[PDB]
Design a binder for this molecule. Structure first.
Ligand SMILES: [Zn+2]
Ligand SMILES: [Zn+2]
Lengths: 274, 7, 274, 7
């Protein structure tokens, strides 16, 4: 301490760290061109203007949703599977999995790009939910995401074929508990020997607090624009902050690991398949 | 609390 | 097998059963005069007529609530603490606790009468929530139940003093996970050496499924009007069904246990304190 | 499923 990025890379290369837990947020997906709905200059922002939302978070609040589900469904249509592709940061995580290093990847993102990059569902915790499935808000019948796709793409609010209630994608709204898969953290975090935090400001609970659940000996590597949350006001001696652009931090780590050419080959072959 | 909330 | 009610009583009197888990539903509270909101002949039913609910369960459904919280708040006003008192069945459970037999009491009821009868919160799992606390539906600020009492009693929808959102009592609505305290069942049920099920038709999940979580050797005593749910289609050899009026079944068990005079003294002294 | 539902 302080450890450097190169030290963390050597810990991995020497097989001193064998079980990596990863936490990711919106910063890993901006490079795929996913618009920040809350910032001017995207089709999504402009499409949301007509609704004059009181504030951006209302898009994931139940009282607002029931009053008018159209803004949320504007976002759903943009983020529904097939529109965006994973980028280098996702394929780095996929390569990490393929090399036997991934214990679990916890994501706050709802773009589904981790599964699209080919990481097994069993290795993933989609902590803020998924568009792969949906639930009637009235009768609780579950539906595959594909079942409401036609309505979503046509700007029709999806209705339940049994009771006519609004059918909502399984995205976690504020105030709702995270999906039960989130409870894997109880066993996963004490088992981790390295924590990687990529592209997140750690502003949402209870996801953010996971950073404290690894053992005091376990290095915590942050690759992010700045120092954030519990990492910023709860510094440990084995914390490494690689502050900067997320993709550049990943590219640096990948080169230190010795994986550059392999990563490039993987990315070329994968994107073609999409 | 169980709920998703901004910190 | 089949065991009788008298056999279960002897198991308790001989201290062969020392750790009782209890599950209760609406049948234990009808004797306190709590109206079934979904049946003609009560002030509550009549007060709910003006809203012409499509069906009774809508009172605990979020889409309906947000569309019109007034029916739910009509129910809240009726059930808010201080209106109803516990009856003999609650005081039987209180006496069970006082005699060192209660591992945990799981209730589907939201009338709060278990805590009013003097059973410690630590022994209780209020699985369908409580009017003792409330949560802003928009900003998630928690409030003591007492903070919204004035509005509830005056038929005003309680609003949040910080963001003006509707403040909703912590009652579990359909589709919502049960409170995290419900997870005590994971440890409690395997630890139980007797399961008592009182006054419930076991029609709501995931509460109902708890009946299967005790060990195959553990007797399951049902005191209820009829045979219900997993007990009815998943009979075990140590199941006892005391079918009949709930209070009469309790009074019979109490007499077999040898607790009648003590129970009567307890009830007299407790109700006075209210 | 985690949710309260009629059986
Ligand atoms: Zn439905
Ligand atoms: Zn509020």
């Amino acid at each position: 301490g302080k450890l450097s990025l190169q030290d963390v890379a050597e810990l991995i290369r020497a097989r001193a760290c064998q079980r990596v837990v990863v936490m990711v947020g919106a910063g890993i997906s901006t490079p795929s061109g996913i618009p920040d709905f809350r910032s001017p200059g995207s089709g999504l922002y402009s499409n949301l203007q007509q609704y004059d939302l009181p504030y951006p978070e209302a898009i994931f609040e139940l009282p607002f949703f029931f009053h008018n589900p159209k803004p949320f469904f504007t976002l759903a249509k943009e983020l529904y599977p097939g529109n965006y592709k994973p980028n280098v940061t996702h394929y780095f995580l996929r390569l990490l999995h393929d090399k036997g290093l991934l214990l679990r990847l916890y994501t706050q993102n709802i773009d589904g790009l981790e599964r699209v990059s080919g990481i097994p569902a069993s290795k993933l915790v989609e902590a803020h939910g998924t568009f792969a499935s949906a639930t009637c808000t009235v009768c609780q019948r579950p539906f595959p995401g594909e079942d409401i796709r036609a309505d979503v793409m046509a700007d029709r609010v999806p209705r339940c074929p049994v009771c006519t209630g609004v059918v909502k994608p399984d995205i976690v709204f504020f105030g709702e508990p995270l999906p039960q898969r989130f409870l894997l953290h109880v066993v996963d975090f004490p088992m981790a020997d390295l924590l990687l935090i990529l592209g997140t400001s750690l502003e949402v609970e209870p996801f953010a607090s996971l950073t404290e659940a690894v053992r005091s000996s376990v290095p915590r590597l942050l690759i992010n624009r700045d120092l954030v949350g519990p990492l910023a006001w709860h510094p440990r001696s084995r914390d490494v902050a690689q502050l900067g652009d997320v993709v550049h931090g990943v590219e640096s780590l990948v080169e230190l690991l010795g994986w550059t050419e392999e990563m490039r080959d993987l990315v070329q072959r994968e994107t073609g398949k999409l | 609390r169980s709920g998703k909330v901004m910190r």
